[PDB]
Amino acid sequence: MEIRVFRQEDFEEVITLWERCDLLRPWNDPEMDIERKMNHDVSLFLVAEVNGDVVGTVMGGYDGHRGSAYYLGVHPEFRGRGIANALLNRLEKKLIARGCPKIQINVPEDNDMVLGMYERLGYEHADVLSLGKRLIEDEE
Amino acid sequence: MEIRVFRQEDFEEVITLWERCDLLRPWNDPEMDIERKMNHDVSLFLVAEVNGDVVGTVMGGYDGHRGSAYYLGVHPEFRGRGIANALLNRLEKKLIARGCPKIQINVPEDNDMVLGMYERLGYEHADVLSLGKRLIEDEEYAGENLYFQ
């Protein structure tokens, strides 16, 4: 199992994996999200590969003040193998390497698995409300 | 009132404004924070200038999926002039201009005024928990600064 940067050739395989991990939402066009990432900086968009197949992802990022992580997924048949942790551990190292001082992540309260992973990785709850505003509406 | 990008020359004036606006925290060194933006991409770090002086800021940003905003402040003597709204609108337009599809801003839980303000600007509260992990410890640096003593 190896962690590496996303490549353009992984496009369709990643989208299929996201579908299999129930990560897609109607308001985010995954094709558009990958294109945005490619255009901006692909270097923190990581994939986990096992036997030549992409079985996990994290779309990591840095905005010049805080790090981020979206689209964290592990194929349902590859759970309990340390892949999500390997992805986040590598992301954190890439973030520190470029001077990012802190990573932030939002998770729905009902996602007890993702929440639990982050708590075990040393993430702490922030006493804040996350407010959002859509700027460009995607198609489904 | 001119909204423009932060420049090197604004460095001290902005830190003084942040101190005045009670935006400094012990765990974020403002010189380090500004240097990080300079090194990464200064373009979404906006300032508002009135009569030649910097009176407002927003440290905007984009990570390739979502936009962000930190260090939003307006000098106390320049309130009621729409400066915060003008800064945020300009940031949102710069974000749109580069294809950013959404901006998200975290606000303290106990600030109903600030929550109300953002709701009126078209922001909505997300049903999520917010977690964080410090990666580099600014407060461990032993250099002493003239600001925030």
Method used to determine the 3D structure: X-ray
Query: Out of A41, A122, A138, whose CB is closest to B101?
Result: A138
Helices (H), A6-56: 11-20, 30-40
Name the strand (E) or helix (H) holding B33.
helix B30-40
Extract the tokens encoding B42. 């200064």
As a whole number of angstroms, the distance between CA B78 and CA B33 comes to 24
User: Could you tell me which residues come within 8 angstroms of residue A121 by beta carbon, excluding any fewer than 6 positions away?
Assistant: A85, A88, A89, B133
- Interface with chain B: mutation pick from A32, A57, A131, A137, highest number of B CBs within 10 Å: A131
Q: Is the dihedral of CA B45, A122, A25, B122 positive or negative?
A: negative
- Cβ–Cβ contact A29 with B under 8 A: no
Instruction: Report the phi/psi class of residue B2: left, alpha or beta, with left for phi > 0 and alpha for psi in -120 to 50.
Output: beta
Stated length of chain A: 140
In degrees and rounded to multiples of 5, residue B110 shows phi and psi of -95, 15
As a whole number of angstroms, the distance between CA A100 and CA A63 comes to 9
A1 three-state secondary structure? coil
Extract the tokens encoding B103. 């901006």
Q: How is chain B split into domains, by residue range?
A: 1-149
A120 contacts B124 by C-beta, under 8 angstroms:
no
Q: What is the CATH number of domain A1-123?
A: 3.40.630.30
As a whole number of angstroms, the distance between CA A13 and CA A20 comes to 11
Extract the tokens encoding A112. 């007890």
Q: Do A125 and B131 touch (CB under 8 A)?
A: yes
Name the strand (E) or helix (H) holding B18.
helix B11-20
Extract the tokens encoding A41. 């900086």
Query: Out of A41, A96, A123, whose CB is closest to B132?
Result: A123
Q: Is the dihedral of CA A71, A75, A76, A80 positive or negative?
A: negative
Looking at this protein, which amino acid is placed at residue B77?
E
**Superfamily in which the B1-149 domain is placed by CATH:** Gcn5-related N-acetyltransferase (GNAT) (3.40.630.30)
Concatenating the DSSP letter of every residue in A75-139 gives: -GGG-SSSHHHHHHHHHHHHHHHTT--EEEEEE-TT-HHHHHHHHHTT-EE-SEEEEEEESSPPP
The angle subtended at Cα B25 by Cα B19 and Cα B31, nearest 5°, is 70
